[PDB]
Paper text:
Gram-negative species couple polymerization with translocation across the periplasm and outer membrane and the master regulator of the system is the tyrosine autokinase, Wzc. The tyrosine autokinase domain forms the cytoplasm region, while the periplasmic region contains small folded motifs and helical bundles. Autophosphorylation of the tyrosine-rich C-terminus of Wzc results in disassembly of the octamer into multiply phosphorylated monomers. We propose that the cycling between phosphorylated monomer and dephosphorylated octamer regulates glycan polymerization and translocation.
Author numbering:
A (entry chain H), B (entry chain G), C (entry chain A): 17 to 64, 85 to 261, 409 to 477, 494 to 721
C-alpha cells in the first residue's frame, strides 16, 4: 500500500469516517456540557515543618469537627430522573434549588447493606413540604419541627419552586468524613516554607468555601489549644470537566476508531475491485456494467442510462467475440446468486433486438428464474413443460412488449430441473431456435450452486460469466470457470456487473472502470 | 499468515473462544462474589523518630496484651460445609451468626501435630446449646459455666438461629499473635512526621476496630509507663476482594487461553482445508460434497439436499471425464475408513439412475461393506458367494427400492477377501456387467488399509478417490494415488467429501467450496 | 524521487508556494503589528529566606489591598468594533483615550452568568459625557457625581476626543485580584539572596508601574506591622508580541505548509506527465500538441501558432503512418470528454487541406458534436438525417470558409445514435467518400463513454486516440485501446494534447515535449 491507496480508501470511506467521528465528538460535547461543573476553593495557612501539620489537617479529628459544625452528614441533592437531568437543567438556565436543614434523624434502618437511610422531600410551596421515605407520606412546614413515624426533620428556608423533589440522605459520620477527605488536599508549595495550600473541590461553589473555612478555623483553634493568610475563596471557573481536552480527545478518538475500522474493512474485503484483477488471472472481461440508480427493461425505459451504454459496449464486443463459434447460442451464467445475470441478459437482448436482429431469450433457470414475471407472463407452458413433453416449442415462445425479442419462460418449478435439462428435447429446441433466430440468450443458475449451467453450456457456442462487483471474489470466478472446463464447457469470458465509482480504484490502478456519462445535457 | 487468516480462524473458532472466555469470566465472578470481604480499619498516632516505635507496635509484648484483653485466642467461625457456603449465605442476605465467649479451656490434646484443639457448638435456642469435641455431646446454657470432661466453656449472648454450628478453636498465644501481626501494618506516611498510620485488615468490620483500638491503647499506656489523634474506624467498603480487577483479569485470561488453544489447533491440524490443496499437488478434484445435516438414500429422500446437488455436479463432471475410458466400470475408493465413499457412491448411482441409465452398484468391500444393510438385503449370495463359486451372477444382482439401479452385496465376510477378488470370476462378472449396464460403480476398501482396491482397480476404466474434508491429509491422498500407480492403477482424480463452511477458507483462499443453496423458498 | 525531481516540482508549483508563504507571512505581520503591545515593569526588594515572602506577595491579602487602593475593579477599555480596531488606531498614531474614574457602583445585575456589569460611556466633550448601560441614556458631567437608575459613577478628567466610547466594567474583587495575580510574578534571581524581583506585565506602561509600586509598598507596610531597592519602572520596549519570532514562524510555517500541499499533489496526481509514459506501455505517440493561448480554426487564424506547428508534425507523421492501410479513412477518438479531439481533428484537416488534398471532415459525434457550430452551419441534413434515410449524401456535405476541406455535420441529436451508426448507410457513405476524397477524418465520441467509436472504427483504416495532457491517465488510455481491440478495432496510436511546459518533466525525463518556437521575430 502507498499514499495514493490509503488516500483513496479514506475518500471512499469518508462517509463512515465522518459519521463515526461526528458521533464521537457529539458524545464528547454532550459529556463536557452535561457533566456537573466542579469548582475549587483554596486557602493559605502560615505554619511557624508543616509535614505533621499536613497529616493533622486530613485527620478525622479536624475533619470530623467540620462535619458536625456544618451538618455535612445531611446530604441534599436535587432530584433528576435521568443521568442528564442535572446537566440540561443547568443548560436551560434553571437555578439549582436548595433547602437548608439543621436537624435530620431518620429511623436508622441499618439493614444488611443500606447504612445510609434516605427520604424524598417534595416542595409544595414556599412554606410547607411533603416527605416520603418508603411511601409513608408526611407533611411538614418550615419552622415547626417534625417528630412522626420515627423521622425527625427540621427544614429551614426552602428556596425552590413547587414540585422540586429532593433526595435527603443521612450518611454515617465516617462516610461524610471520607467524602470531604477525598476532595480535600494539602500541599506545601515550597517544600520548606511554612505555607500550606488547602484546596477543596465540589459541585457547590459557596458550600466548599464555607467547609474549607471551617477546616482552617477548626485546625486553627485546635493548634492554639498558626496564621490564616488567605481565607477560602472559590474560583468561579470550574476546574472540571475540562471541556477542551474532552472534546479534542473526542475528535482524536473518533478519528483513530474510524481509521482502524476502515483499515480492517480494506484488509478483510476479498471481492473484485476492478476488471484488472480478473484479467491478471487471464479472464477476459468484455464489459463493466455500472450500478444503475433505477418491471420494464432498463434498456427500454431509460435507453440513455449509463448501464445501458456499457451494455451496448458489451453488444459490440460480443459481436466480434461470438463470430467463429459453433452456433448462435449465447449462455450467460452468474457465478453466485444475485450477481445480476438476468439484469444483463434481458437488457442485452433488448440492445441487440433494436439492431434488427431476431433474439430469443431462454430463461433456463428452472429453480429461481423470474424472467416471466419481469416481461409479463402467460406462465403456463414454459421451458419445464416443454422438456417434460407437455408443450410444443411454438407454444412456449412469447413476445416481450417492452422488448423487441422473443422469450421463453422457465415454467412451473420442476422437481428434477437438472434432469429435465439433460433430456434430448433441450438440444432439439436449441437446434430449432438456431434456425429461426439470429442469437439465442440463455439464463442459467450459478454453476457454484447447481450443475444446470454445465449441462446447458454443452449446447451453447459462447458462454459468459456474470460477476458482481464487490460481492464475488476473483477466485470465486476462477473456480466457476474451472468447473465449467471440468465438464467440457469453455467460458469465453466474464462480465463484471454493478461497478461503482471509487477513488481507491483510481489510485491503486490507473482507472476506475465506471464510465463517463456523455450527452449534451438537453 | 495475515490479518485475514487469523480473523477467519477467530470466526471459525468463535464458539470455543466464547465458551472458554465465558467459563473463565464465570469463575472470576463467582470468586469475586463468594470470597469473604475483608475490611480495613485505620488509626492515627502522634509521636513526639517513630522508627523504633514502629517495631515496638508490632512486638509480641504490645500485641500479646491485645490477644489477652480481647480473648483473641478463642477463634469462632460460622460452620459451612463447602468452600462457598460462607459466600452464598452472605449473598442470600443471611446475617452471620456470632456468639460471645469469655472463657475457653479445652483439654489441650497437644498431640504430634494438632496444637489447636477445636470443638463444635450447635445452637439449640437463644439460651441453651450443645457441644461435640470428638463426638462427646455436652449441653450448656448461657450464663452457667461448664466444667465437664476437661472442657471449660463460657458462652454469652448467643446471637444466631437454631441449627447454626460453630467451630471453636483455642489456638496458642503465639498463633493468635502471628495472625494479628500478619494483618497489622504500621506506616509513617511522611517518613519524618511523628504520625503513625496503624492499619488492620480482617473479615469482621466491628472486631478489627476494637482490636486496633486495643493495640493503640495498650501501646499508649505502655509508653506513658504519645497522642491518639484518630481512633480506629472501619472503612465500610471492603478492600478485598477487588472485584473489578478480578473480573477483568478473568476476561483477559479467558481470551489469551482461548487464543493460544486456537493458535495450536491451527498450527497442528494437517487435514485438507480446501480442494486447492489437492490441486496444488496435481490431483483433479471433480466434486466437493458438503456435509448433509440428515436407511434411505439421500438422493431419494431429499433430492433437493445441498449434498445431492454437488453429487449432480459430480455426475456431469464424471460423464465428461469417463468418456475415452477402457470400459464403463467406475471404481470409488476412500483413502481412509469413514471417508464417505459408500455415501458418495450409492447416492451417485441414484443421481445417474434417474437419468434413465442402467447402473450396477458393486459393494466389493468384502471386509466392512454394509451396502446390503442400507438398501434392504437378501444377504445370501452376495459378491463373496459368487467369487467362491457357490452363486451365479444372476442370483447376486438385486434391485434397490428407493434406488433406480441394481446392486450386488458383498455377502458373508470371507476369510480371504483379497484372494477372492483375484479369482478370474471377478473380471468375468465385470465383463458380463459391462454389457448389460451403462455404468458399474464399485465400492472398495481404502487402499491404505488393504490392497483390495488395487486388485479391483485393474479392471476399472475410471478410478476415483474419496477424501474426507478434515480427517484426511493431502499427503495421505498423495500416498494413496502413488500406491495405486505402483500397482498399475491410475487414479483419475479425487472427490472431497464432508466440506463444511468456514470463514478461514474464505480469507486464505478466495473461495470456501461449500456451495450456494438455490431454490425459491416455496 | 531525486533532487532534480523535487526541484522541478518546486519550480512548477512556485506560484502556489509563493502565494501560500506570502499570505502566511502577511497574517504573521498583521498579527505582530496589530496585537496590543504588552510592557513589563520590574522592581527590586531586599529581604533580610524569601520563600514564604514570595507566597505572601502573591496572596489575596497583599494584592487585594492594591486592587482597593487603585480601584483596579473599575475596568476601562477604549471601544473598538473589530478585533483589529485597537491595533490599527495605534498604527495611525492615534493616542489611546483614557478617563479617570474613582467611584463606580453599577446596579449589580448578578444574573445567572454575567457577574460583571458593564456600561458604555460616550465622550461628548471635555466636560460632559453620556452613559448607556442597556439602552438607558444618562448624561453626566466631570465633577458632579451621578446617582440615577441605580448607577453611581464619578468620572474625573476625561482625556479624549468627542465620540470615543468606553466599556466600563465593574468586575468582582476576586477577578481583579486574579487578573493582577496572573500578570504578577515573583522570582529570587539568586535562590539564596534576599533579593526579590517583582515583575508585572500589562498593556499600559504607566499603570503597571503604579500597580507594582502599590504592591511593593503594601507589602512593605504589612511586613513592618524589608527594603525597596529599585522602585517599579516600566521597560519602554514591549516584551510581547515578539515580532521577529512571529514573522519568522510565519515564514517557516508558510513554507512547510506549501511543501506538504505540493508533496501531496505530486503523489496524488495520476494524469499523463509526458509521452514517455504512454510509450513505456507500447503506445505510439505521433504528436504532442501544446496548449494554445488562443469560431475560426486555429490553423487558419494563426497558422504560425505553436500548436499548429505540432499539428503539421502530426500531418507528416500520419502520412508515413497511414500508408499501407485499408482505406483513406482516419478516425480520431478522445479517451475522455473535453480531450480536445475536435480541436485536433478540425485543425488537422486544415493543415492537410492546404497541401492540396481533398479532405472530408465527418462529425460522427451524434451526441455532443459541435463541429457544425464551429464552421458555420446549415444545421439541417447532417449525418443523423442521412443515416435515418431522410437526406442524400450530396446534401449533407458542406464546405468550410476558413477551411479548405469539406465537412459533414452531425445533424439533429438522434434518440438512437449508436444504432444509427450501425445502419449500412454509414459504410456506403464512407465507401462513396473514399472515392471522392484523399482523406476522411471522422470525429467520434469517447469510447469510455459510449461504444459509438468502436462501431465506426470498423470502417476506418487508421484509428488514433486523443489524450489530454494532465486530465487523462495512462491506464485510461490503455483501457481505451483494449476496449477498441476487444471490438475488433486496432488503434494505430495516441495523440497527446494540451501539453504545458513544466520543469519537473525536464528533470524526471530528459525532455519536456513542449516544442521550441521558431521564427525570425519579424
Amino acid at each position: 500500500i502507498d499514499l495514493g491507496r490509503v488516500i483513496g480508501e479514506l475518500i471512499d470511506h469518508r462517509k463512515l469516517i465522518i459519521s463515526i467521528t461526528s458521533v464521537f465528538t457529539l458524545f464528547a460535547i454532550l459529556y463536557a456540557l452535561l457533566a456537573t461543573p466542579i469548582y475549587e476553593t483554596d486557602a493559605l495557612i502560615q505554619i511557624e515543618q508543616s509535614a505533621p501539620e499536613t497529616a493533622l489537617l486530613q485527620s478525622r479529628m479536624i475533619l470530623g469537627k467540620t462535619i458536625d459544625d456544618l451538618n455535612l452528614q445531611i446530604q441534599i441533592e436535587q432530584k433528576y430522573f435521568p443521568v442528564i437531568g442535572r446537566g440540561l437543567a443547568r443548560l436551560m438556565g434553571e437555578k439549582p434549588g436548595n433547602i437548608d436543614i439543621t436537624r435530620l434523624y431518620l429511623p436508622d434502618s441499618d439493614d444488611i447493606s443500606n447504612n445510609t437511610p434516605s427520604i424524598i422531600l417534595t416542595v409544595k410551596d414556599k412554606e410547607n413540604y411533603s416527605i416520603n421515605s418508603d411511601g409513608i407520606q408526611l407533611n411538614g412546614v418550615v419552622g415547626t419541627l417534625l417528630n412522626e413515624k420515627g423521622i425527625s426533620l427540621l427544614v429551614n428556608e426552602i428556596d425552590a419552586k413547587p414540585g422540586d423533589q429532593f433526595v435527603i440522605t443521612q450518611l454515617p459520620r465516617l462516610k461524610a468524613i471520607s467524602d470531604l477527605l477525598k476532595s480535600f488536599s494539602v500541599a506545601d508549595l515550597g517544600k520548606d516554607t511554612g505555607m500550606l495550600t488547602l484546596t477543596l473541590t465540589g459541585d457547590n461553589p459557596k458550600r466548599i468555601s464555607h467547609i474549607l473555612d471551617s477546616i482552617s478555623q477548626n485546625y486553627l483553634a485546635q493548634n492554639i489549644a498558626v496564621r490564616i493568610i488567605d481565607n477560602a475563596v472559590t474560583d468561579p471557573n470550574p476546574v472540571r470537566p475540562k471541556k477542551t481536552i474532552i472534546i479534542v480527545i473526542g475528535v482524536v478518538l473518533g478519528l483513530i476508531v474510524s481509521v482502524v475500522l476502515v483499515l480492517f474493512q480494506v484488509f478483510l474485503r476479498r471481492g473484485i475491485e476492478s476488471p484488472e484483477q480478473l484479467e491478471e488471472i487471464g479472464i477476459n472481461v468484455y464489459a463493466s456494467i455500472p450500478i444503475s440508480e433505477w418491471d420494464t427493461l432498463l434498456a427500454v425505459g431509460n435507453p440513455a442510462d449509463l448501464a445501458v451504454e456499457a451494455i451496448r459496449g458489451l453488444r459490440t464486443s460480443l459481436h466480434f467475440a461470438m463470430m467463429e463459434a459453433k452456433n448462435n447460442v449465447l449462455m450467460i451464467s452468474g457465478a453466485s446468486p444475485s450477481a445480476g445475470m438476468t439484469f444483463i441478459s434481458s437488457n442485452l437482448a433488448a440492445t441487440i433486438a433494436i439492431t434488427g436482429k431476431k433474439v430469443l431469450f431462454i430463461d433456463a433457470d428452472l429453480r429461481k428464474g423470474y424472467a416471466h414475471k419481469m416481461f409479463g407472463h402467460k406462465n403456463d407452458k414454459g421451458l419445464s413443460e416443454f422438456l417434460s413433453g407437455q408443450a410444443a416449442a411454438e407454444m412456449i415462445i412469447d413476445k416481450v412488449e417492452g422488448g423487441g425479442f422473443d422469450y421463453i419462460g422457465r415454467g412451473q418449478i420442476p422437481p428434477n430441473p437438472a434432469e429435465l435439462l439433460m433430456h434430448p428435447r433441450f438440444e432439439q429446441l436449441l437446434n430449432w431456435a438456431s434456425q429461426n433466430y439470429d442469437l439465442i440468450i440463455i439464463d442459467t443458475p450459478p454453476i457454484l450452486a447447481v450443475t444446470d449451467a454445465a449441462i446447458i453450456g454443452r449446447y451453447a457456442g459462447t458462454c459468459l460469466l456474470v460477476a458482481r462487483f464487490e460481492k464475488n471474489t476473483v477466485k470465486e470466478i476462477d473456480v466457476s470457470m474451472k468447473r465449467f472446463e471440468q465438464s467440457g464447457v469453455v467460458v469465453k469470458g466474464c462480465i463484471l456487473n454493478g461497478v461503482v465509482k471509487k477513488a481507491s480504484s483510481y489510485y491503486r490502478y490507473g482507472h476506475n472502470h465506471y464510465g463517463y456519462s456523455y450527452y449534451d445535457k438537453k
